[PDB]
Amino acid sequence: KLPEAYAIFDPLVDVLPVIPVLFLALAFVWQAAVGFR
């Protein structure tokens, strides 16, 4: 478990490792907006 003073962000941390994935999803939202140019 995390040290207690960070107890707080426990559920943020359960989510952090997936954020790199979001960047790939994000590249497709960008290309949808620019018309797959």
Partner: peptide, 27 residues
């Protein structure tokens, strides 16, 4: 409590695109 901080991260990305468009930026 996994909406008090997560929802905002997933929205963060598409929000950058809705603000650069609707303000025409170099996309």
């Amino acid at each position: 409590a996994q909406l008090t901080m997560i929802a905002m991260i997933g929205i963060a990305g598409p929000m950058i695109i809705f603000l650069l468009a609707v303000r025409r930026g170099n996309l």
